[PDB]
Design a protein around this ligand. Structure first.
Ligand SMILES: *[C@@H]1O[C@H](CO)[C@@H](O[C@@H]2O[C@H](CO)[C@@H](O[C@@H]3O[C@H](CO[C@H]4O[C@H](CO)[C@@H](O)[C@H](O)[C@@H]4O[C@@H]4O[C@H](CO)[C@@H](O)[C@H](O)[C@H]4NC(C)=O)[C@@H](O)[C@H](O[C@H]4O[C@H](CO)[C@@H](O)[C@H](O)[C@@H]4O)[C@@H]3O)[C@H](O)[C@H]2NC(C)=O)[C@H](O)[C@H]1NC(C)=O
Ligand SMILES: *[C@@H]1O[C@H](CO)[C@@H](O[C@@H]2O[C@H](CO)[C@@H](O[C@@H]3O[C@H](CO)[C@@H](O)[C@H](O)[C@@H]3O)[C@H](O)[C@H]2NC(C)=O)[C@H](O)[C@H]1NC(C)=O
Ligand SMILES: *[C@@H]1O[C@H](CO)[C@@H](O[C@@H]2O[C@H](CO)[C@@H](O[C@@H]3O[C@H](CO)[C@@H](O)[C@H](O)[C@@H]3O)[C@H](O)[C@H]2NC(C)=O)[C@H](O)[C@H]1NC(C)=O
Ligand SMILES: *[C@@H]1O[C@H](CO)[C@@H](O[C@@H]2O[C@H](CO)[C@@H](O[C@@H]3O[C@H](CO)[C@@H](O)[C@H](O)[C@@H]3O)[C@H](O)[C@H]2NC(C)=O)[C@H](O)[C@H]1NC(C)=O
Ligand SMILES: *[C@@H]1O[C@H](CO)[C@@H](O[C@@H]2O[C@H](CO)[C@@H](O[C@@H]3O[C@H](CO)[C@@H](O)[C@H](O)[C@@H]3O)[C@H](O)[C@H]2NC(C)=O)[C@H](O)[C@H]1NC(C)=O
Ligand SMILES: *[C@@H]1O[C@H](CO)[C@@H](O[C@@H]2O[C@H](CO)[C@@H](O)[C@H](O)[C@H]2NC(C)=O)[C@H](O)[C@H]1NC(C)=O
Ligand SMILES: *[C@@H]1O[C@H](CO)[C@@H](O[C@@H]2O[C@H](CO)[C@@H](O)[C@H](O)[C@H]2NC(C)=O)[C@H](O)[C@H]1NC(C)=O
Ligand SMILES: *[C@@H]1O[C@H](CO)[C@@H](O[C@@H]2O[C@H](CO)[C@@H](O)[C@H](O)[C@H]2NC(C)=O)[C@H](O)[C@H]1NC(C)=O
Ligand SMILES: *[C@@H]1O[C@H](CO)[C@@H](O[C@@H]2O[C@H](CO)[C@@H](O)[C@H](O)[C@H]2NC(C)=O)[C@H](O)[C@H]1NC(C)=O
Ligand SMILES: *[C@@H]1O[C@H](CO)[C@@H](O[C@@H]2O[C@H](CO)[C@@H](O)[C@H](O)[C@H]2NC(C)=O)[C@H](O)[C@H]1NC(C)=O
Ligand SMILES: *[C@@H]1O[C@H](CO)[C@@H](O[C@@H]2O[C@H](CO)[C@@H](O)[C@H](O)[C@H]2NC(C)=O)[C@H](O)[C@H]1NC(C)=O
Ligand SMILES: *[C@@H]1O[C@H](CO)[C@@H](O[C@@H]2O[C@H](CO)[C@@H](O)[C@H](O)[C@H]2NC(C)=O)[C@H](O)[C@H]1NC(C)=O
Ligand SMILES: *[C@@H]1O[C@H](CO)[C@@H](O)[C@H](O)[C@H]1NC(C)=O
Ligand SMILES: [Ca+2]
Ligand SMILES: [Ca+2]
Ligand SMILES: [Ca+2]
Ligand SMILES: [Ca+2]
Ligand SMILES: [Ca+2]
Ligand SMILES: [Ca+2]
Ligand SMILES: [Ca+2]
Ligand SMILES: [Mg+2]
Lengths: 690, 905
């Protein structure tokens, strides 16, 4: 009966459920002895049945999962009603769900996700304005018109926006000398003053307008090889409204031919202030660059993820490797090959977008201590993902449904109030909120009225039929009140026999009951009414208490399902008893404690394999011709399992053959064939001789 | 916990001057000790200079109300008139504006170096803007001012060391050697430059602004791939070589393609001895560096700070946890993989930004190290973590946490920006720690206090107490009192001769929870006694003797439970003010609580005296030990007590050999059939404890029969030793005389010999089978068996031996002639015998040796005697040459056997 609930010594019903879900608390506790405490009330559901009495009053609540709404996503995108508006169509089926958490019970739900066939795309193009990328600018002017046409096939709603990020103005990054300031390049060449962050234009439905703005843009340059693209990218995401971000998937195109400075690179610059991730742009110009130091890569990931802006990197083969390492850090982003003059920029964007769309990942909200989440996913072509692979599926085409079972476990009842949290994948405005209302109350406790006069005018909580004595009260009635001013005649209830020590000399006696004295080596308080039982007074099988695996109960070793005996180390395993022949303990004997006890006379050995005195097999095993066939005598096929061979006049004269007399007094020739170790082959001559 | 964070000294600097950026100790001890604080954006009086920056020195005073900035530069930036005459007016050759002087402050002895990297110089011949970087060297109590421009050179633009920012990170060696590392030279590759104080002063020339020194040592030039490595970002001095020359520790933040590595380079060799590579990508490994011995082996260990490390929590959300690294140097080799690491929970902690050696703060024999978290804390004020020194490794958990007393403001405090430690400001024998807070423009220094270790030990000699007789009787009522006395000792360094302490004694503490207090002090008539005791550092422990009396009333129903005596003390809260000003402290390891239990003497005697005289006599049955046999040894011991009662928990423990194992115990006493016996594995030798009884009974004699199994143990190499003794919990004469019984172990063998004849192609088959079985448990090698019949296996021979098997055997005559097939007494001696001597080496317990002899009868020979009864007889003797045992003092098994076979017609 050893379990956490019993070990917990549950004071009230609420503790039986908290200690173990299987354990149930009987309010009636009729079976429970008055002397026995509240712990004895709590018992396993299977264990309660062991008693043979079932209590209706006992409460065993089980956690359940419910759903507030069950909306249906449009299927096949057919008809005017389907995809009527962005808010109107929801990819996620269940908007939110409600479940009940029970300690020791897992809770899993099914989430149905299907890709929407039609979804608008917004494309913000961040292009390095460095002198090396000049050639790229001329192509980017005629690119916008080509882009719009290609993206129209991909999506019936495409918006093009141009962004120009160079580097933060500082004495070290860019030449302080005023002559260079006017133009970063040589005097003969024409280069515009460097600007760390500038907006050429916002997102528009017409690509032609974009073309005109690109042409006005003038080539710029920076002294350092790495450019401050990171600062420009961060500003775009945080502002949002400025870039005119919409629910339509946003491709964060980022094209540069050089490296990127990150985190506290301002140090040489002398700026010790980190980026605040806030919008300070004025007239499409960010002038807080010499105020805030370049933001860290982790900080940039937090912003892009928060605004769900897909990040696509279009960099040259020289810096390709560096950007690939960064890719793992920033999610919902891709890396493609960039031409010297951005000739294949349009081809990259198209390919990059397809890869990002196929990969879908689920992210949940911050969870309090004692709360965990498990992900189980379903994929096409028989591919199953677990752990990290379980959370995100891949190779998802338009109109393809993928489901993700999520398991949430809540224990310790930390918060009584309901916890509401929201879970959503990157690039998807639609989210899923799982709300949980923890129940830690007791139905009987609600029914139970405080200060009940039955239990000595409420001295002990009398909820339902269960009476739990309060501090200073021991028993069913708790009419003791411990020590009093007028000394009483000890406690008659404490000792069955007055002559014997109060509570069998095992503890302190009060309120007409017995609380056993604490023991450091074993469970402090012993079991029993008179505390006469003990948890460390049992026998040891071999230097280990109760076989080393048994549980001591009232100074009595109880063995496990695999053990039997006072020692309790005696296993029920008969594997050691078995021999090569295949009969337990050879021919005869009883397998007890893993050591065969030979029964048949003059049988010695571990499996009693040595019986020299024992009569010869041919003589003793004469039942093979008289039990299988010509049935007569005793019994049967348990011992003589050897196969009979139909051999006539076999030349095997001495293995050693044997001869006997039959019913008609006819000689019978037979033998048992053994060549190596133990072998079994019977050769009884069919042809009879009289 | 030694540092006095509660009242840290505060240094005041002008707002916006970035006061507290860099703080270091210069010329500590001797005449006077002063604190230097860097003021880089600090407004200077220099003409034409804006936000030049300055270093402020504050003389140690009970109150730091006075702080004077060091006058490093008393003149304006130099302008050359010759070029100015040719040109229109005058143009600044160099700009002192935004110099950020004081960004680094290093002081060795009387020499102080203040360098601002942002400071630049315009080329005289043509105008070029580059961060060359400057410094100001002060020595001999500011006797001679020297200006050193190492990064300054003819080489100009990205190609030259014109952006070097020399002095960004500067460290002084133990010899006062200057080490300036700049991260902007050679297209921002970085360059570490070092020169001695004497060489730099001699090389420096006032007339020529740009000068060169012969024998100057700097870092080597690197390729375009090595560019933007930011070499020298953080410099430190550490010794791993063990040579007189001191190695330079300088981590790269943007090195190894933005991964960041730390390289240790010897100034004389101008090369890197060993390099450390960061695991976390964009780790920024080398942002903060430090060299000190943190494990007490006398070998410098290298610490590196990576606050940009972004770790992943159980939820999976990404936070800038960061990691602090430190590696304990070994003589055999230097391990790259970090032995220990530090992880910061604080999201955006930025921890490990500044690291400062603190010497041995706890005087534990291990040096400690402070780490700075600029954006640490709930209010993001900033925090500094002090980790305790450990010989195996520095403890992961911080020893103490320091939080700024001042209320948080909207402007980031940036605490832990600069950390200085390992130098004793007041020479109290405990290293101090000064923290830089440039955001609040203040400077905070934390003083320490000495730790004193004490020990409380309460011992009661007259614990035995009986209420029948009271030694002390009061006028009101009689109540016997047990003499109670507790001794306390105190020792330490930098503590007063007399130290105030607070002793507190509790009687029946486990009965103080609403229970009737059994024992009370006789003098104050109360259970508790708190007291003050002045204890000298070198004085012997003083034990104050007190008398505690137990009550004699029928009020308490239960008195079975023993009285509990608890002594608990602590340093007095109102400690007397000391000249040093540091309050005394008590070490956590020392225990200031001693717990004792007193049990009333029950039925001791008329005089209440308990004296047991246990007697023990033991013997062993079946004493002979057969090696290799399942020997059973029953221990027979008669235990008796001719002494008085009070020997509580009497128990006989028989220490077993490795060989012997316990099965059970049977006694003769009527009350208990089987005495309880529990295993005691903790005892070095297996010991079985059987309780004779709960309360000792005078004249209680108990005969105990213990059966012990003997699992094989041939490694004993002598007679097994079993020790029998009686143990008691009594204060005096607790144990009985020890009884040691030696059990002789002598292996014995027993080989049986049994022979029978099957009788008892011409000639009926005759089978003679001789079998030897080693019934005895001792297997014997080299068993020799001599088999012999009365025929030579010839033709005139009546019998024809065919073969013999089951043991290897050699026959003098051919065993196989050609191929595998009144009464006359035919016996070996009568005719030609055919003796065959066999030999069997491999033998085991219960092994059966059986030799089958099958000599057929020669028909022609038999026909020689037509009507004669023949009786064939074959004999066999055997022996055993030796047995495989360490000792064999017994008889070696031997025997003989005959076999007969009659023939009739
Ligand atoms: C811990 O980290 C440290 C920092 O990363 C490591 O230091 C680095 O270690 C690597 C590997 O040893 C070095 O790589 C080698 O550097 C050599 C430097 O030689 C050039 O530079 C020096 C100093 O300025 C100069 O004296 C030389 O003469 C040479 O400069 C040449 O100058 C001429 C002048 O006209 C110019 O034309 C040349 O262009 C220029 N050098 C060239 C060839 O471009 C190189 O020589 C080494 O090159 C190897 O391969 C060459 C081609 O086959 C061959 O010719 C060379 O003989 C040689 O085999 C090689 O590149 C890093 O420089 C060094 N970085 C530093 C010091 O910061 C440290 O090593 C590491 N721990 C270890 C393992 O020790
Ligand atoms: C609380 O428990 C008591 C005692 O069980 C209930 O009183 C009634 O007692 C009788 C006799 O014990 C119960 O009969 C039982 O029936 C089962 C059937 O398997 C049998 O195995 C038992 O030996 C016994 O004969 C009876 O069930 C029970 N009353 C009812 C209505 O079942 C009492 O009702 C319980 N409720 C409360 C709040 O007291
Ligand atoms: C892990 O992968 C295995 C496949 O290797 C999944 O087992 C599959 O279980 C599904 C049902 O959950 C079976 O799909 C059924 O297919 C039949 C047609 O064959 C269709 O008529 C049913 O409506 C249903 O879709 C599938 O046969 C079965 N595959 C096999 C052979 O194992 C398993 O479900 C995956 N892990 C999960 C998500 O539990
Ligand atoms: C819960 O316990 C409290 C005590 O902690 C009860 O209050 C008082 O308890 C005393 C002792 O049980 C009562 O005195 C009793 O009087 C009867 C005769 O009426 C006598 O036979 C008993 O031996 C005892 O002396 C006392 O009446 C009672 N009330 C007072 C005045 O405080 C309390 O009644 C119990 N119920 C609750 C929760 O109210
Ligand atoms: C810059 O850091 C990178 C790691 O971020 C280094 O790449 C690493 O290169 C080594 C091979 O040289 C790979 O194995 C290492 O080998 C050494 C022995 O040579 C061994 O002691 C180390 O434990 C390690 O296994 C290593 O796998 C590879 N990076 C990875 C993926 O771990 C690179 O070597 C560093 N800079 C250079 C090129 O020196
Ligand atoms: C660089 O820019 C200047 C303008 O700032 C160019 O001057 C222009 O030249 C064109 C003819 O090519 C004239 O039509 C414009 O009127 C001029 N503008 C001004 C403001 O003078 C100059 O030609 C450019 N130089 C180059 C291309 O190197
Ligand atoms: C994208 O969808 C959301 C769905 O609510 C639209 O509503 C915005 O939701 C965000 C959630 O943080 C709020 O911060 C905005 O204030 C909401 N905007 C308004 C005015 O409804 C959102 O408008 C859509 N995208 C747009 C048009 O910005
Ligand atoms: C962008 O770069 C490509 C590089 O191939 C240019 O393509 C070449 O254009 C020249 C004419 O200017 C042809 O002679 C070459 O044959 C083309 N490439 C090859 C490999 O054949 C392209 O013209 C450039 N576009 C612009 C105008 O920037
Ligand atoms: C990703 O899915 C696509 C289908 O949408 C896979 O491409 C085809 O898959 C089918 C079914 O397995 C095969 O019969 C075809 O031969 C595949 N190729 C064609 C012609 O589309 C694709 O293989 C999947 N991912 C990969 C490449 O492993
Ligand atoms: C540290 O720097 C020195 C340069 O002084 C390195 O060169 C050694 O110089 C000493 C003379 O001072 C020679 O005796 C050694 O032979 C030189 N090095 C070797 C081992 O060849 C020296 O190598 C560096 N430290 C060491 C010895 O590791
Ligand atoms: C207080 O503490 C010490 C710690 O052991 C006690 O033991 C003494 O230790 C010192 C160490 O130098 C020895 O010199 C002494 O001989 C030890 N005690 C004795 C018996 O002299 C010490 O006894 C305690 N206080 C006292 C009684 O001096
Ligand atoms: C020993 O006695 C002292 C008496 O002061 C106890 O110290 C007090 O402990 C309580 C409970 O922890 C605190 O609330 C008080 O603040 C302590 N004293 C004061 C007022 O300063 C001490 O707890 C006792 N021994 C133990 C177990 O610590
Ligand atoms: C202990 O106290 C008793 C009085 O109860 C006294 O007679 C005796 O001398 C004391 N012994 C000491 C102080 O050693
Ligand atoms: Ca280009
Ligand atoms: Ca740049
Ligand atoms: Ca050295
Ligand atoms: Ca060390
Ligand atoms: Ca220490
Ligand atoms: Ca000090
Ligand atoms: Ca006595
Ligand atoms: Mg560029």
């Amino acid at each position: 009966d050893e379990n956490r609930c019993l070990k917990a010594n549950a004071k009230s019903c609420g503790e039986c459920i908290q200690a173990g879900p299987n354990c149930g608390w009987c309010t009636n506790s009729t079976f429970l002895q008055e002397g026995m405490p509240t712990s004895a009330r709590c018992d396993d559901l299977e264990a309660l049945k062991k008693k043979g009495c079932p209590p209706d009053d006992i409460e065993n609540p089980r956690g359940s999962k419910d759903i507030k709404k069950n909306k249906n996503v449009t299927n096949r995108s057919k008809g005017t009603a389907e995809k009527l508006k962005p808010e109107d169509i929801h990819q996620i089926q269940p908007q939110q769900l409600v479940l009940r958490l029970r300690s020791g019970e897992p809770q899993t739900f099914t989430l149905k996700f299907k890709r929407a066939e039609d979804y608008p795309i917004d494309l913000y193009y961040l292009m390095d304005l460095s002198y090396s990328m000049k050639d790229d600018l001329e192509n980017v002017k005629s690119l916008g018109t080509d882009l719009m046409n290609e993206m129209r096939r991909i999506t019936s709603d495409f918006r093009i926006g141009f962004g120009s990020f160079v580097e933060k103005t500082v004495m070290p990054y860019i030449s302080t000398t005023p002559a260079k300031l006017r133009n970063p390049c040589t005097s003969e060449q024409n280069c515009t003053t460097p600007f760390s962050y500038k907006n050429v234009l916002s997102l528009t439905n017409k690509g032609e307008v974009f073309n005109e703005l690109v042409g006005k843009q003038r080539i710029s340059g920076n002294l350092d090889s790495p450019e401050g693209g990171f600062d420009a990218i961060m500003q775009v995401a945080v502002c949002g409204s400025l870039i005119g971000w919409r629910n339509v998937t946003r491709l964060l195109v980022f094209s540069t031919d050089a490296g990127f400075h990150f985190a506290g690179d301002g140090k040489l610059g002398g700026i010790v202030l980190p980026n605040d991730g806030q919008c300070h742009l004025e007239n499409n110009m960010y002038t807080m660059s010499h105020y805030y130091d370049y933001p860290s890569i982790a900080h940039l990931v937090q912003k892009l993820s928060e605004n769900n802006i897909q990040t696509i990197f279009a960099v040259t083969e020289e810096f390709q490797p560096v950007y690939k390492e960064l890719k793992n850090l920033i999610p919902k982003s891709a890396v493609g090959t960039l031409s010297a003059n951005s000739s294949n920029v349009i081809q990259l964007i198209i390919d990059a977008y397809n890869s990002l769309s196929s990969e879908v990942i689920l992210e949940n909200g911050k969870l309090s201590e004692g709360v965990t989440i498990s992900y189980k996913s379903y994929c096409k072509n028989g591919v199953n993902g677990t752990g990290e692979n379980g959370r995100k599926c891949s190779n998802i085409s338009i109109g393809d449904e993928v489901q993700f079972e999520i398991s949430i476990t809540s224990n310790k009842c930390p918060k009584k109030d309901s916890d509401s949290f929201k879970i959503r994948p990157l690039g998807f405005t639609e989210e899923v909120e799982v709300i949980l209302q923890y129940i830690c109350e007791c139905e009987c406790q609600s029914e139970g009225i405080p200060e009940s006069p039955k239990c000595h005018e409420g001295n002990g909580t009398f909820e339902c039929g269960a009476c739990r004595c309060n501090e200073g009260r021991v028993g069913r009635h708790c009419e003791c009140s411990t020590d009093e001013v007028n000394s009483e005649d000890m406690d008659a209830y404490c000792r069955k026999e007055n002559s014997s020590e109060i509570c069998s000399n095992n503890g302190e006696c009060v309120c007409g009951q017995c609380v056993c004295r604490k023991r450091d080596n074993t469970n402090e308080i012993y079991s029993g009414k008179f505390c006469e039982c003990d948890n460390f007074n049992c026998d040891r099988s071999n230097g280990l208490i109760c076989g080393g695996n048994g549980v001591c109960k009232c100074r009595v070793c109880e063995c496990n399902p695999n053990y039997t005996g006072s020692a309790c180390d005696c296993s029920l395993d008969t594997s050691t008893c078995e021999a090569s022949n295949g009969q337990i303990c050879n021919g005869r004997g009883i397998c007890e404690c893993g050591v065969c006890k030979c029964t048949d006379p003059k049988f010695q050995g571990q499996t009693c394999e040595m019986c020299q005195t024992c009569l010869g097999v041919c003589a003793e095993h004469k039942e093979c011709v008289q039990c299988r066939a010509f049935n007569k005598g005793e019994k049967c096929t348990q011992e003589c399992s050897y196969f009979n061979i139909t051999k006539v006049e076999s030349r095997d004269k001495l293995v050693s053959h044997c001869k006997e007399k039959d019913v008609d007094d006819c000689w019978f020739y037979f033998t048992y064939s053994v060549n190596g170790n133990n072998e079994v082959m019977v050769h009884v001559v069919e042809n009879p001789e009289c | 916990f030694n540092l006095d964070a509660e009242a840290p000294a505060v240094l005041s600097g002008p707002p916006g001057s970035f006061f507290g950026f860099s703080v270091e100790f210069y010329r500590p001890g001797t005449d006077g000790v002063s604190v230097l604080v860097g003021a880089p954006k600090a407004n200077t009086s220099q003409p034409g200079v804006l936000q030049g920056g300055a270093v402020y020195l504050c003389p140690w005073g009970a109150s730091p109300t006075q702080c004077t900035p060091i006058e490093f530069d008393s003149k304006g930036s130099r302008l050359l008139e010759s070029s100015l005459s040719s040109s229109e007016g005058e143009e600044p050759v160099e700009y002192k504006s935004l110099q950020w002087f004081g960004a680094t402050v290093r002081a060795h002895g009387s020499s102080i170096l203040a360098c601002a990297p942002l400071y630049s110089w315009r080329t005289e011949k043509e105008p070029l803007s580059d961060p060359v970087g400057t410094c100001y060297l002060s020595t001999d109590n500011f006797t001679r001012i020297l200006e050193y421009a190492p990064c300054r050179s003819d080489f100009s633009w990205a190609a030259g060391q014109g952006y070097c920012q020399g002095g960004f990170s500067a460290e002084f060696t133990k010899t006062g050697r200057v080490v300036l590392g700049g991260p902007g030279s050679y297209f921002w590759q970085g360059q570490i430059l070092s020169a001695t104080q004497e060489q730099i002063a001699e090389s420096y020339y006032p007339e020529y602004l740009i000068n060169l020194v012969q024998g100057q040592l700097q870092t080597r030039q690197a390729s375009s791939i090595y560019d933007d490595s930011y070499l020298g970002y953080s410099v430190a001095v550490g010794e791993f070589s063990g040579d007189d020359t001191e190695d330079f520790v300088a981590g790269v933040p943007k090195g190894n393609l933005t991964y960041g590595y730390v390289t240790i380079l010897n100034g004389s060799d101008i090369r890197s001895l060993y390099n450390f590579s960061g695991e976390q990508m964009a780790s920024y490994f080398g942002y903060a560096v430090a060299a000190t011995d943190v494990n007490g082996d006398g070998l410098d260990d290298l610490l590196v700070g990576a606050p940009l490390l972004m770790d992943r929590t159980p939820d999976g959300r990404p936070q800038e946890v960061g990691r602090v690294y430190v590696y304990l140097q070994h003589p055999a080799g230097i391990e790259p993989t970090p032995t220990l690491t530090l992880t910061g929970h604080d999201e955006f902690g930025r921890f490990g930004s500044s690291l400062t050696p603190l010497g041995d703060l706890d005087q534990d024999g291990y040096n400690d190290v402070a780490i700075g978290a600029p954006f640490g804390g709930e209010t993001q004020q900033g925090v500094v973590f002090v980790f305790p020194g450990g010989p195996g490794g520095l403890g992961s958990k911080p020893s103490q946490v320091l939080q700024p007393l001042w209320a948080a403001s909207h402007t980031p405090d940036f605490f832990g920006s600069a950390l200085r430690g390992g130098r004793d400001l007041d020479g109290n024998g405990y290293p101090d720690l000064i923290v830089g807070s440039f955001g609040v423009d203040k400077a905070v220094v934390y003083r320490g206090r000495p730790i004193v270790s004490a020990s409380a030990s309460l011992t009661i000699f007259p614990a035995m107490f009986n209420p029948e007789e009271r030694s002390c009787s009061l006028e009101g009522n009689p109540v016997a009192c047990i003499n109670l006395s507790f001794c306390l000792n105190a020792s330490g360094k930098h503590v007063a001769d007399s130290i105030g302490f607070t002793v507190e004694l509790q009687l029946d503490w486990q009965k103080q929870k609403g229970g009737v207090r059994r024992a009370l002090f006789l003098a104050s008539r109360q259970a508790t006694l708190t007291q003050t005791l002045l204890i000298q550092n070198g004085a012997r422990e003083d034990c104050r003797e007190m008398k505690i009396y137990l009550r004699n009333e029928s009020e308490f129903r239960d008195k079975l439970s023993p009285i509990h005596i608890a002594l608990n003390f602590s340093l007095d809260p109102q400690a007397p003010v000391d000249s040093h000003g540091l309050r005394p402290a008590l070490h956590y390891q020392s225990k200031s609580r001693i717990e004792d239990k007193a049990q009333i003497l029950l039925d001791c005697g008329e005089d209440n005296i308990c004296v047991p005289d246990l007697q023990l006599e033991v013997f062993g049955e079946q004493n002979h030990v057969y090696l290799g046999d399942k020997n059973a040894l029953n221990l027979t011991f008669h235990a008796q007590n001719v002494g008085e009662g009070g020997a509580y928990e009497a128990e006989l423990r028989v220490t077993a050999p490795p060989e012997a194992e316990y099965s059970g115990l049977v006694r003769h006493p009527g009350n208990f059939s089987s005495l309880s016996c529990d295993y005691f594995a903790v005892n070095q030798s297996r010991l079985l404890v059987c309780d004779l009884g709960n309360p000792m009974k005078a004249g209680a004699s108990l005969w105990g029969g213990l059966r012990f199994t003997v699992p094989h143990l041939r490694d004993t190499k002598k007679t097994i030793q079993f020790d029998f003794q009686i143990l008691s919990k009594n204060l005096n004469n607790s144990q009985s005389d020890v009884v040691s019984f030696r059990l002789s172990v002598e292996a014995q063998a027993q080989v049986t010999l049994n022979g029978v004849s099957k009788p008892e192609d011409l000639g009926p088959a005759v089978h003679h089978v001789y079998e030897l079985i080693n019934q005895g448990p001792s297997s014997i090698s080299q068993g020799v068996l001599e088999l012999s019949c009365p025929q030579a296996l010839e033709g005139q021979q009546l019998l024809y031996v065919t073969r013999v098997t089951g043991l290897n055997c050699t026959t003098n005559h051919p065993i196989n002639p050609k191929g595998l097939e009144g009464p006359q007494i035919l016996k070996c001696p009568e005719a030609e015998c055919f003796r065959l001597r066999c030999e069997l080496g491999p033998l085991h317990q219960q092994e059966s040796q059986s030799l089958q002899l099958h000599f057929r009868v020669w028909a022609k020979t038999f026909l020689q005697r037509e009507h004669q009864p023949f009786s064939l007889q074959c004999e066999a003797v055997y022996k055993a040459l030796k047995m495989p045992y360490r000792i064999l003092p017994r008889q070696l098994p031997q025997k003989e056997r005959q076999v007969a076979t009659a023939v009739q017609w």
